[PDB]
Amino acid sequence: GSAIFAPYRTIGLISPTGVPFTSIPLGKTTFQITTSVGRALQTYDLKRGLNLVFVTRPQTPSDITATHAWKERVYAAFGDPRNGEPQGLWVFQRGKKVAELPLPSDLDQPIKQILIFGGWIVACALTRIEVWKAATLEHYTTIFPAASKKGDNELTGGAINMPTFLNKIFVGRKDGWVEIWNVSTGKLIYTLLPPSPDCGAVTCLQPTPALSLLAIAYSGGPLVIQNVLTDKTVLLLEAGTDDAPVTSISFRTDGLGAGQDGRKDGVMATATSVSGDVTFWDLNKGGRIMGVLRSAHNPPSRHNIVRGGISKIEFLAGQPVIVTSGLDNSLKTWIFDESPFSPVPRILHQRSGHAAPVRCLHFLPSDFDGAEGGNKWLLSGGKDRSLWGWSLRRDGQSAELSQGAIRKKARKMGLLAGTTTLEDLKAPEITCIASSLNRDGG
Amino acid sequence: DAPAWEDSDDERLTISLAGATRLRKLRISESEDLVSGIEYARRLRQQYLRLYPQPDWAKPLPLDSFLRDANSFKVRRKLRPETIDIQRTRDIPDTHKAAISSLAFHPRYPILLSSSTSSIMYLHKLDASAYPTPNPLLTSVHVKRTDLRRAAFVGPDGGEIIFAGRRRYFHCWNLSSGLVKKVSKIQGHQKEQRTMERFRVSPCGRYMALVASDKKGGGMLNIINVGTMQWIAQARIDGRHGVADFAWWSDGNGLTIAGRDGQVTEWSMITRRTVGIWRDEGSIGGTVMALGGRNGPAELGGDRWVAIGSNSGILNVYDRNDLIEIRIKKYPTPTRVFEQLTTSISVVAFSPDGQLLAFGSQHKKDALRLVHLPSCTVYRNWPTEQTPLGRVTAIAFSSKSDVLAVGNDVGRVRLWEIRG
Amino acid sequence: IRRFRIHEFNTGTLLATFLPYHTIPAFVTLLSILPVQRIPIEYRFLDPYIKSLTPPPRAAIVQQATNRPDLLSAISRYTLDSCRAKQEYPGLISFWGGIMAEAVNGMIDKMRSGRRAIQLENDHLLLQQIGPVLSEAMVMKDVPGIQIASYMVVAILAAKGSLNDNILTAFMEQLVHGWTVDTLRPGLVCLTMLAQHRSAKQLSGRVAKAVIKVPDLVSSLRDISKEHQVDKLANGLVLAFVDRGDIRTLPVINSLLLSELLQEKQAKVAYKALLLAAHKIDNIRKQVGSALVRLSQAEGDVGDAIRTAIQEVDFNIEELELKLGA
């Protein structure tokens, strides 16, 4: 290490990695958002704008690989032991670690995802599910699913509980199967097989706001909704293209917003990590689509230095709000409108960091002896070809320094539609900047 | 609707309702505290439905199936008649000091000849993807004392360039071996062509027709064997002020004169005479003509369309299959008449494929509109007022009909992609 | 009104249900005594007329339909509820035909932009708007008038807008699914439009199935091609028929080949398709032989094109003749 400078924080970041967020409702007036830097986690307010409420300390020594936030605590799994890195799970509360989770010693797997309910927490690694009693924070059992094939035994997609099922977990195989296990006895009770078995893997799964119906997203493409005790399929949808699989899905519990009248419920948002677009379906009659949101972030590309995607969707508690965190260090919260009908939501909140590394870095001189001062504003010229004024004081009061109605320019053109792209429209990247507030009168 | 799988752990399990504060309000009587797991999950179902009532989707057709299909939503052609996927591309970096005389595209490769009345020719390769100079300059050739009026690519393969201006002589440059010929005698017509101004080369690259400086009641011009550079024929029509414009047919055997007052004359070589005369309808005086198309009257050269631009400024477009009556309608009817520019049209040109018709006047700022065949209407979404054309002087389609080149009278040629 | 305050409580449905009478003084008086802040957001276009009492015209209502989708949405919902409750009536459906036709006409008349993905995406959004009503009216089986009106709107949708072949065939497929016999000949006109503006040369299956189900095919087809240019439809038909290995389509194939409706190019490529079908087949071949000798002994330019197509494929008519006759 060093002798002068101690590490304090990595900024320019709201959600750049692949890990999705986690979202809890506080009371009937706020929603907590929780996102991983990659070496920490922050929790934002929803009603109070998108300022930062909690910053997670101390830093995990390794890259975080899973998280979820309960009523008070932040549960974060870090560490892919497949390459050197020590792993663990920690329990924070209000940005500070209160506890640590006892790992099994025989875990040579990175730990994929986290779920909490009842008095139990369940954690899915790669093909392996470990359980702790949450009331004691103690290791209870370890679930080991089995398949005939080295491929098919892989636990891709994920797992969920139904709201009305006592102690039952629903996991997706690398095969198209969903397995129900009772966690109390740790026993695989049931499994369900994919209809039209050309579809390969459960890429995702989500309970619906109705009772005992699971939606399953297949890497082979179909979105299905099924009764989960009757094993009764409610609907098929051909929405996933073959090499363009869907990422995830959510339903609107706000109670209205379908059927083109405003007078109907049951809307699905879905998204694919191949795109930057998302999709909206009215589920009532034919499960029709109604609306494409085109390029809600930058879509991922390997030909370009641009980094992005869509790591999640969520409908929050019963309101027009939907969060999408991408991989383009990107959150934009969207809003359903009431007085007209609209296909799409419009944006209502945003936070952004770059989609590429930072080229140049500079500070602002003092409001000559005042408060805007030495250490408030830092200008960053990012290889995403942009200029950002970052606030060391309160990270929300940082902003972009726009170049105009550029997004609307793209929307009038087709940069958001399907030529160049949006970084190619914004000015080229940044060699070197200099500032002087000796006239900068605000 | 029978439940497929069953558990025994729920019958084994029981829960204390009155002890549970959250679950306290879910009882039916003030006696139910210890409740089995199956009844407990049933009360959970009641609580959940009381929280949220059941939805109607929780209670095929071809386009409904297409509708639920999302592969239905994913992000040169032949081109539809009212708009164009048009895209202005990079500009030629080298300018001209004088007004632009002409443009010419090479028939095989994307090679462009720009030509200025500053006695100067430029050759460029079309390369938007070039560095650090897109659309690179091949050559800058200057010809002394000789302001270029017009030049032509000779060869369907495009091997030579002839160029001719206000001087009484013209030149042929063979690119292979790079040789120059200064032709200065048309075998007894040296009082008869005091210029070499207007000329047209056959599409087969065989015949060169030069107009005459003797108007006096009727235009005349000479046909030349190109490879031999010799007088082979002459055509002469009776009008008022001589030759307005003229063009071969798609074969290169017969041709068309338009002279002022709008008189158009078809003339075949195998008969070595004028096929006939007709009138561009109501045009008081023509200034430009052009001829293009396929699948027309093969006896009249198989080309489909004739373009007539008159000194008023109206654009008369006709179908030669409708020109037939080998007999000729003396008063043909307009397939399409065009009143979308005020002053006299400066230059008009056909696309190679037979779809597009570019036309413009030069007295106004940027008089240029574009026509789709065979609907014969304008493209109402290009060009804008702030489309930087200039007082247009030269218009060339590319060989493959993907590229538009235009040039004003200032020395600034610009380029467009015609995407269909 | 004077008991149930309907003008205040059910402004939208009352306003829509008197909306198709936009030149009568009863409608004028309704406009007189509505409350302004109660008029629906879709319906707030009459505000100049409620300032100045005068019956608004169709141009005004439809211009709002163009650059206001939701008016069309609401009137579509009313009239489809009318036909779903079987209480449709000719004034209603004629009004609704004029409304949708000029409406979507204006919608494309802006939606053509010139920018490539923009026109594709705009057509997407348009399709999402018009989806439910056009499907319900394409297969509204009890109401032939709204079937005709759906024919109208999707026909203009085809002929004007440069739509993609899959969407076009999907329109074809629902129309196939939904027609009747009183609607038969007009639906044939629609398929002439649809296949005529199609770009690919073949039809997708069930369309050909129902066109076999069509009773008076070549007679109706000559009647419509008297003014309508049905050639791409006939070509897609015969492609689908030689693709089908069923042998009950052969009288239809023979009649359409003699019909003098397809081009010489279409006729020769269909004849080569039929002989390659005879080459791939493994009686059946006896029916193929009787059909092929009928076509080769056809009299006019159809038979002449068949014989010259035999000449250009260079296979022996005598070989197959004696092979099927022996």
Binding site: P163, D254, Q319, S339 | - | -
Partner: peptide, 22 residues
Amino acid sequence: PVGMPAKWDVKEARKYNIEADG
């Protein structure tokens, strides 16, 4: 002016606790 979305507000909406799934 019509067609306008109002000031966004938090709506009150009750939820189901899954913490009782033990």
